[PDB]
Design a protein around this nucleic acid. Structure first.
Lengths: 76, 94, 328, 109, 84, 99, 87, 97, 94, 112, 76
DNA sequence: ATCGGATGTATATATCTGACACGTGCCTGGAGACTAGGGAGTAATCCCCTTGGCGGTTAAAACGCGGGGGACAGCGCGTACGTGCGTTTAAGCGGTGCTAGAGCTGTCTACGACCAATTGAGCGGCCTCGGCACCGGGATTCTCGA
DNA sequence: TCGAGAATCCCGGTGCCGAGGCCGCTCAATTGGTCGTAGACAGCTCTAGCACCGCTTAAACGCACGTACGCGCTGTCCCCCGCGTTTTAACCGCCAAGGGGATTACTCCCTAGTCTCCAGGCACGTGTCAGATATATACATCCGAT
């Protein structure tokens, strides 16, 4: 199915997803397709701060829907 | 993750009780982070070599009072002992 | 053979007993006599014309035969001024104020004739509220010229020693009263003995002193604490009373009112304590610092002068800064 | 199990009395640490860090910056000659020196 | 290996001149520009040799930031403001 | 005709001008090269985490200023103004580091 | 109490030949005339930073004697170690 | 006709005479009175076990003698020989007191 | 009675293995009695502030070797490490 | 379990290795003390005290006495630059100084 | 009854005793009559080293019999 | 450069007496043997941090140069400081009483180490934003030429 | 001794990006327990400090000259500051690659904490020798005079 990834500067990228795979896998594909670090990104949709071990369907975001992208400083 | 701890939150609370408008840049907090952990090295490090000369085994609330009047000079002496003795008298009646 | 110092006004002349008691090599009953004639010739100019006759110059204090001729003309010249004031010449007023150099001429002949051991009144140990150092005469002559005390002020010294700080401050200007206490026996036995002579010696010059009360009253008692609150100008001797004394002394200073003075040795604050919350032990939330004059004749233990610190107590500095954080 | 109470609040202080009490048992400064001791140690750090910052910002007020840069510390610590003898070997990073010209180096008319 | 040699010309002739102005001097004579490099090379022999010996003992192979403060302290020149 | 100043007044600007700023005065990258070659004859590979090589630059001005502050007093004491090679070694020895 | 201890004329102990005897050990040759009123000011300072801790150490055990084992423990934290007395 | 040495070469026997010996230079009893009149200022009564006064004397030489070996060097520095009051005030200052 | 102990018996045994004829006055033994208890203060006092910078809890036979090459200068360094390492190699085969 | 092999004998040393191992635990230098360490520590006090006593004993045979007076221990520290930096802040009791005159103070032979 | 106290230097002192009192009491009387310290003395009779809490009859030494005196260094 | 006359300094013999160097019975801290625990070591992974690389820019560095003033070398000049000596004044040896105070020895209540339950202050991590960095005016404020 | 030529603070704009403010947490941290080892302390002992006397002399105190030695100054030259023009590297982003950082279980080998057996270091006393003392020779050194 389809996903929208909204950036906070006003841009979206449309991507090929499976809801059965984890969101860590699609954020790895976000790394391979844009270069955003896995530690640095965080994706939210309607007050729902995602976790990497969970999948897309586990937080009930459907087809042709958008995840909002915001960044945090990585640290160690 | 493993956390790590400093003194930087408490020193900022002190600053409201002197100038309640100003601020401190994050570069300068590292001085005060490295300022208390030098005096606290000297003071408690001085009581430990004082427990031997009376050959005891308990650093109590009195050998801090002996070491304070040694390390700090005479001008800041006569206010420092007051600022602790006033505090302990609150702590007994508690 | 007894030596008699007659009074120039005609009231309570001096009766020194025989023989002369010796205390030390610098202040006896004879060394105060050479400074006695010099001060009655300053106030009354006619007496210097009579003292030059039948009086030799080469006299000293270790010879009584050179002393009897000094008191022979002195006993003769006082009867010549009593027959003169009853005629057409007006006598001296009994209400004037002397200079600061004649004030030391009081506390020589009041002190030395009252105590037989001044070094026993030097009984002091540190870390105790009883150390009375070398607070001389000229430390006290400055404390009247800085601010002028009127008749609603007060002057209490919890710890006056012999009270010689009170015998001068109650001799330049006035208050409601003046006071000075000391608890233990011999540091107050030579304090009430001062009260047996300053009530006699000030009337010998003809000058009026301000009112005082030296006694043996308790310095840590409850009732005199609000008398410090009734006192404007505070003199407590915090040279070396101690850290265990200064804060309970600051438990006495708390109940006071505005405009009051604290004449004390130590700087109660480092000269810039503003309204912000750093006062839980000191009394300097309601005062600022005023230095007294540095000393030049009295030496300390190290070799530095002993300066005192006036503090004009102001709760005006209280109320004018609660609302500075709210405007606008 | 009544209502909780922190040990710093009974002192009326700001520095952590609890954290210091964890430090003296982990420096091997002795075998046993008395109960009344780290109350007293936490008081003297309150006073001795109040003397820096009250003397810091006053030197910062004269230079018209509402923050405190480390330039504003070195010009304050070497003012009181009492505080100078305690830190006579510390060189502050980015510190600089006090304004200072010797007497001969002034020009002579 | 890049054989380093003749590297003492880093501390150059105006740089000693600018450092002297902080100390408040007015006329520098011509012979100081040799002698300062003699002193400055001596002072860095002592610090780094203590700094290596700590980080030899920890058996890691990078001189940390704390491995200068923890060697400057024992000489009697502590240094605040580096995570101390 | 372009007006030269009298000598000894360019300097008295720079004493008034370097004593007010807090910047470090030695070049950064040539100072890194001096540190590595003295580090070369021990252990043969020293990585030098970049905060430390900056941190070591603070301890030269902690030492060269403190030497030039006191060697000036050695020269002024003997009625001369120019510092000299016989002004360092006197000021280093009384400090007690030349053994 | 009754023993009089106002012996304030006591700076004359470090007297004019003694200091002249001292500086010969350092090896000087001609001593100027104004050093005597200055070296006496030096020595009274350095004793005033040694006794003033030596009392503080011997006050701490609650006894009334600065013992000979406590002068050594005060000179150590200033930087002048002293051997030769069991320290 | 009396034997008078030229000035300068009398002291240079004493430098040969005192640098060989380890006698305590200052008199014992005048120094022993001085210690009590400094304890007099901030203690009520002290007793001073007598080996301490034999110990405190030792640190009134290694502070004085170590000064005079250093204050000589600055006097040579200004092409002079006699040490001065403004030489100690320099040689104390670089030491950091 | 309570006994008290020093190092004076052992230092005299060292003297036979250098000059087997001489002697030491009893005044000078107090220097060597107060000489070992100053170095032993510094050396073991240096390993204790070295166990923290690697955050361990056991002062072993290696941090003495680190502290020795710090305190003593370079000339006496290269003989001191030999004189211990030769000793420990005897102590393992024992 | 035969008889009495002390650790100094099992090492080849002179300083008491058992005594040092008590004087670490009762000084509070760490929590757990090593076992191989005070063997090593007893060598460094040996090699140092063998270095000092050899030096003064050399000078003591030239001043023609045969004991070692504390004046002689002063003369065998300040005259060896291996050691003078190690004890540069020590004042030996009854010490004395080194024979030391500066240059210019020597009597100039202007026309001798 | 009678007691003999032999000293090791060859002297005896004859004393008035009770066998019912402890030997600590008669050694206190030895202190009052000769000055010998209680800690320093020890009295033996035929291989019997006495104890202070016991009496004279408890170790079976009879009338007109001798106790041998020897000394040990006191210490602390 | 040659001396004679005057100090002092080492070399010298001879002698005493306080302090070392061996001797000894001795109580206790060594050592041996032992098990029962947890620290440190050995292995192995993952992502920040250093390293070498490369154009461009330009502030900074050499480099010749052309005057003045400061190091400095010489010298007269009057003074403070050393030599030496003739009265003086406590320091040094030693003897004698007094005793407050140090060092133990037990009998001892008050205490902090210790363990394991139930929370809140610290802690990250975002963050909107406003002191603090900048250029072009703008004064005073300066100095070397007459 | 005044009129131009600079560095200079002051005023305003105008950008950015570091602090102050916000939460939702994993956890030290109190609370509430008590067990055992201290330090508190009352006797009590007595060794060492204080004070005081007198006696003896070797160290401290002022004349009395004198000469070296500090100190101004003067004159000479000469080595370093002040600016110019040329000219080499520091510098900033941007570039990409690898070694060694920290963490993560996982054993397993160690060092406390024990018991008993005793030789080591003490505290003893103890007749003797290097070493201080002291009277004498000696050469080593200064210095008036030549």
């Amino acid at each position: 199915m389809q996903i929208f990834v909204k950036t906070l500067t006003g841009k979206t990228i449309t991507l090929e997803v499976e809801p059965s795979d984890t969101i860590e896998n699609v954020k790895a594909k976000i790394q391979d397709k844009e270069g955003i670090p896995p530690d640095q990104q965080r994706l939210i949709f309607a007050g729902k701060q995602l976790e990497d071990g969970r999948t897309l369907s586990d937080y009930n975001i459907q087809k042709e829907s958008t995840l909002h992208l915001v960044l945090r400083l990585r640290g160690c | 993750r493993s956390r790590k701890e400093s003194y930087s939150v408490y020193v900022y609370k002190v600053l409201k009780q002197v100038h309640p408008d100003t601020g401190i840049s994050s570069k300068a907090m590292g001085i005060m982070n490295s300022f208390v952990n030098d005096i606290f090295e000297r003071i408690a490090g001085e009581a430990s070599r004082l427990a031997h000369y009376n050959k005891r085994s308990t650093i109590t609330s009195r050998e801090i009072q002996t070491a304070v009047r040694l390390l700090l000079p005479g001008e800041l002496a006569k206010h420092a002992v007051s600022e602790g003795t006033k505090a302990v008298t609150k702590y007994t009646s508690a | 053979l007894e030596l008699r110092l007659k009074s120039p006004v005609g009231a309570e002349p001096a009766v020194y007993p025989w023989p002369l008691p010796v205390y030390d090599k610098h202040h006896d009953a004879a060394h105060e006599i050479i400074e006695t004639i010099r001060w009655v010739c300053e106030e009354i100019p006619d007496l210097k014309l009579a003292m030059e006759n039948y009086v030799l110059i080469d006299y000293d204090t270790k010879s009584f035969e050179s002393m009897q001729r000094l008191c022979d003309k002195y006993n003769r010249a006082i009867d010549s001024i009593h027959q003169l004031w009853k005629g057409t010449t007006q006598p001296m007023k009994l209400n004037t104020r002397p200079s600061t150099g004649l004030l030391r001429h009081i506390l020589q002949q009041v002190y030395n004739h009252s105590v037989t051991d001044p070094e026993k009144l030097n009984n002091y140990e540190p870390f105790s509220p009883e150390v009375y150092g070398e607070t001389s005469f000229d430390l006290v002559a400055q404390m009247i010229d800085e601010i002028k005390m009127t008749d609603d002020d007060l002057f209490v010294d919890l710890g006056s020693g012999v009270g010689q700080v009170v015998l001068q401050v109650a001799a330049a200007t006035n208050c409601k009263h003046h006071y000075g206490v000391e608890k233990a026996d011999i540091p107050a036995k030579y304090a009430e003995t001062m009260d047996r002579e300053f009530r006699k010696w000030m009337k010998w010059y003809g000058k009026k002193h301000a009112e005082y009360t030296l006694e043996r009253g308790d310095f840590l008692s409850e009732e005199w604490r609000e008398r410090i609150a009734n006192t404007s100008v505070i003199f407590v001797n915090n040279f070396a009373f101690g850290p265990e004394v200064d804060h309970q002394l600051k438990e006495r200073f708390a109940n006071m009112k505005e405009g009051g003075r604290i004449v004390s040795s130590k700087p109660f604050a480092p000269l810039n304590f503003r309204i912000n919350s750093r006062n839980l032990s000191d009394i300097g939330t309601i005062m600022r610092v005023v230095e007294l004059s540095p000393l030049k004749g009295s030496v300390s233990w190290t070799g530095k002068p002993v300066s005192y610190y006036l503090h004009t107590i102001d709760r005006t500095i209280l109320e004018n800064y609660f609302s500075s954080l709210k405007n606008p | 199990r009544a209502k909780a109470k922190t040990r710093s609040s009974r002192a009326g202080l700001q520095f952590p009395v609890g954290r210091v009490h964890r430090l003296l048992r982990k420096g091997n400064y002795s075998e046993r640490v008395g109960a009344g001791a780290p109350v007293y140690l936490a008081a003297v750090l309150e006073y001795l860090t109040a003397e820096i910052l009250e003397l810091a910002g006053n030197a910062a007020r004269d230079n018209k910056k509402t923050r405190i840069i480390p330039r504003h510390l070195q010009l304050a610590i070497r003012n009181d000659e009492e505080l100078n003898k305690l830190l006579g070997r510390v060189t502050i990073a980015q510190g600089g020196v006090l304004p200072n010209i010797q007497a001969v180096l002034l020009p002579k008319k | 290996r890049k054989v380093l040699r003749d590297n003492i010309q880093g501390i150059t002739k105006p740089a000693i001149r600018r450092l002297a102005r902080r100390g408040g001097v007015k006329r520098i004579s011509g012979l100081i520009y040799e002698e300062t490099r003699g002193v400055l090379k001596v002072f860095l022999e002592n610090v780094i040799r203590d700094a290596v010996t700590y980080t030899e003992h920890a058996k890691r192979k990078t001189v940390t930031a704390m491995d200068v403060v923890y060697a400057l302290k024992r000489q009697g020149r502590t240094l605040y403001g580096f995570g101390g | 005709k372009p007006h030269r100043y009298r000598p000894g007044t360019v300097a008295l600007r720079e004493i008034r001008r370097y004593q007010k700023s807090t910047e470090l005065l030695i070049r950064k990258l040539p100072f890194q090269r001096l540190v590595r070659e003295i580090a070369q004859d021990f252990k043969t590979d020293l990585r030098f985490q970049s905060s430390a090589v900056m941190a070591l630059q603070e301890a030269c001005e902690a030492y060269l200023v403190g030497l030039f502050e006191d060697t000036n007093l050695c020269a002024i004491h003997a009625k001369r103004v120019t510092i000299m090679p016989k002004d360092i070694q006197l000021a280093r020895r009384i400090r007690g580091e030349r053994a």
